[PDB]
Design an enzyme around this catalytic site. Sequence first.
Site: not given
Lengths: 191, 593
Positions: B355, B485
């Site tokens: 991150e 998805h």
Amino acid sequence: NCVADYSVLYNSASFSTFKCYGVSPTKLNDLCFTNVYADSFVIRGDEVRQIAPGQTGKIADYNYKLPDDFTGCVIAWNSNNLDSKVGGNYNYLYRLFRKSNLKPFERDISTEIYQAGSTPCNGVEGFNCYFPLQSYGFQPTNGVGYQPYRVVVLSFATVCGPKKSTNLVKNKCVNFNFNGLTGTGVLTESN
Amino acid sequence: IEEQAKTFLDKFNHEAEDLFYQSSLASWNYNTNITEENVQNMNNAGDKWSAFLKEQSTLAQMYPLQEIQNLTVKLQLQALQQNGSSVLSEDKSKRLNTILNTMSTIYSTGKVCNPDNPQECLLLEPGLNEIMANSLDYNERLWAWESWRSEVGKQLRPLYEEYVVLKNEMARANHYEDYGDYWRGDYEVNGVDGYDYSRGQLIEDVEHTFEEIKPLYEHLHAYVRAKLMNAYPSYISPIGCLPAHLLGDMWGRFWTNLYSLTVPFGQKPNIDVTDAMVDQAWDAQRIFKEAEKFFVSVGLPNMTQGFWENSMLTDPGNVQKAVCHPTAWDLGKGDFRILMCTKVTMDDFLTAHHEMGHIQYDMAYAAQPFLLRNGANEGFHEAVGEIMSLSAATPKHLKSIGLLSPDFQEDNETEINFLLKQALTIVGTLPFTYMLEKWRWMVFKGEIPKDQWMKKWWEMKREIVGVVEPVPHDETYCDPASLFHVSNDYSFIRYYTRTLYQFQFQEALCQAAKHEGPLHKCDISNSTEAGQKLFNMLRLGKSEPWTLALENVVGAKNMNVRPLLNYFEPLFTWLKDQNKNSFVGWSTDWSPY
Ligand SMILES: *[C@@H]1O[C@H](CO)[C@@H](O[C@@H]2O[C@H](CO)[C@@H](O)[C@H](O)[C@H]2NC(C)=O)[C@H](O)[C@H]1NC(C)=O
Ligand SMILES: *[C@@H]1O[C@H](CO)[C@@H](O[C@@H]2O[C@H](CO)[C@@H](O)[C@H](O)[C@H]2NC(C)=O)[C@H](O)[C@H]1NC(C)=O
Ligand SMILES: *[C@@H]1O[C@H](CO)[C@@H](O[C@@H]2O[C@H](CO)[C@@H](O)[C@H](O)[C@H]2NC(C)=O)[C@H](O)[C@H]1NC(C)=O
Ligand SMILES: *[C@@H]1O[C@H](CO)[C@@H](O[C@@H]2O[C@H](CO)[C@@H](O)[C@H](O)[C@H]2NC(C)=O)[C@H](O)[C@H]1NC(C)=O
Ligand SMILES: *[C@@H]1O[C@H](CO)[C@@H](O[C@@H]2O[C@H](CO)[C@@H](O)[C@H](O)[C@H]2NC(C)=O)[C@H](O)[C@H]1NC(C)=O
Ligand SMILES: *[C@@H]1O[C@H](CO)[C@@H](O)[C@H](O)[C@H]1NC(C)=O
């Protein structure tokens, strides 16, 4: 018409960057001159990089031109704690567009809708023509380049810097200087 | 004429970033302090942000793009001038919204009832996926796998047959010949000389690289089968396709959960440093400062200070309602920050490197125009994070950062135990990731008609992935839509291209680092050139295209899979001795029922 302690600004701990562009910072006490004007404004931290002698871009081409031959100084310091607001402190205003390039020391305060290329325009700023004034929404969470800096410019007879005085030794052979007269002798309290 | 377009987009870049900021501020304040008072605030701020964005798009449309010469201004006109949505008639736009909302509520609320006990029912994540991840009862899994499809997946059928209409009419109205071609458009490049790229060429280069994976995947498949034959005996043929309910989750998307059933050397413990983190008593601050010590050690920039005051890394001291989902925030105004619910674990230490590796991307292109402050394609923006995860997972980094003792030792049995868990994650998903996009591309173009949707899907699960239907399916089902998805409108080719680029981005900087061994052992620490060749691409964002950006890092004009395959040559060297009496690959023709 005042004695100017300029080197005390240069020695103070508050300012983040200070520079002089026709003078050295130690000579700021030695300067003497007829008249000067001081300027002040609030700007974004990465845009302070445009606020030196002869430079280009945004502020330097459309707000406030400094010349390459600037006998003067600039001082800049961070101001989040008073000059930023959580909602964005949009009280501060900047110019994005204007015809020609500003003469050194030029100011403008008028406006008309910009009409790039060629078009008539009567308000609305809709297509091909733009309102050039914009506002700087400063917030206390900004990254350093967008934080508010308080900025000052000094545009360097009536104004000498501080005239240093020594102790005065009596009853001894001394070299001396009283105002502008120099000599050597023994100094004694007269009647 | 161009100065009108420059001044119009210079005004967009000064106008937009304020509104982007006070929209994303309410969204930040909501996610850290979840209240209806902050939901309503972030809703009514996000409303005014969108009402600005859509207006500036119909203004940008009056400027003819053929009057432009400069490349910068052109890409920013083309980003803001694009419709996409709002080309539909107002009723059909609301019908598409109605379908999207219906597929969203079906996927998020889809209960599966237990036929042994009708008063107990499972949602997907809090129970039905848990069966597939951590139970070995073939029939409890097979029940969870087919009951998701029959009790939830069937609900999406009549909706996907109409989403595929309204999305193609949207694509057509934009002059993309199908909605697949529209999603392929992210990788397109025009007028840059030589480094140009095509929507259709994305199909050709994916299919030109996929066949380089198949010789590795057919050995890893025969290996995973030879191990699943011991976890699920009599159920699996020694030459078969794999029954889909045995692949470790609700669809078989990654084989990473099969490790405990498939491990090379279960008698040797694979490496950890969670113990050294608690022996030194580290917290979130230390974990992320040891990550900044890694970033200044390769010689990338420090954080902009305000990262530390304005980020959140642990949960709050109050039992505050906040999302624990680890998220990289760019708010504009130079404000970069991470929001997460961290816990002292080596997985969270790799997270910190990952991150903060996202924030190094968000930080590097911050001087580029706002419409250009994004990844050069949708695969770059995660590949640039995961190189910082993988460099930090290594026994060299872990020993030299003091997380392994000087007298800890590693061996060839440990090296293969790591590489197989990398392959079950990285290699096992590539067939699925090519297959799902290929099926959608072929549906949106109409090469698969609605009377062959489920038929071609399972023929491709059997030809590309080597996976077989546990139970027969027909055109009443929609197994593609039974995945997030598809039912929530996400493009998926980003995962193929990212899973290529991650290893290209690794090996390029391993050369710069003077790396001495297999590609996984690589560390880009204490080096300068490994930070410098990367920073040349990281300062770009969208301001130069991904085809050109690859030549600055790697020296490649286009995407490749060789670097990925070189990260597995040591594992393929091992598979070639284990699998000698195995049937390599599979029989497409076997079935479990
Ligand atoms: C979540 O944030 C909101 C606003 O940021 C807090 O709500 C009020 O905030 C104002 C500050 O403008 C305080 O004067 C009020 O006292 C706050 N309300 C209450 C009921 O305390 C809110 O407190 C935050 N959530 C928590 C759990 O503290
Ligand atoms: C149009 O393209 C030119 C170059 O092709 C860009 O010119 C550069 O502009 C920056 C600042 O705007 C200068 O610092 C560079 O020195 C310029 N380069 C050259 C070679 O003169 C220009 O920026 C582009 N237009 C826009 C709006 O970005
Ligand atoms: C965006 O979509 C519209 C169609 O909805 C495209 O066509 C324009 O439609 C408007 C009415 O909404 C007409 O007034 C215009 O005359 C149409 N455009 C032209 C070129 O005549 C519009 O062109 C689309 N945007 C782009 C970038 O093509
Ligand atoms: C790990 O290293 C050792 C030492 O090289 C390997 O042991 C050799 O294995 C081969 C193949 O069975 C034999 O021909 C040799 O006789 C072994 N060496 C000795 C000294 O007996 C071991 O097999 C390696 N394991 C892996 C997984 O690579
Ligand atoms: C890589 O960088 C680290 C961090 O600076 C170096 O670690 C230092 O190593 C020396 C001797 O090995 C110690 O005396 C220092 O205390 C270490 N520094 C820290 C901050 O822990 C390491 O030496 C570097 N590697 C190389 C090859 O130079
Ligand atoms: C980053 O910050 C550390 C102190 O935490 C400092 O030692 C280092 O010099 C900084 N990095 C750079 C590139 O100067």
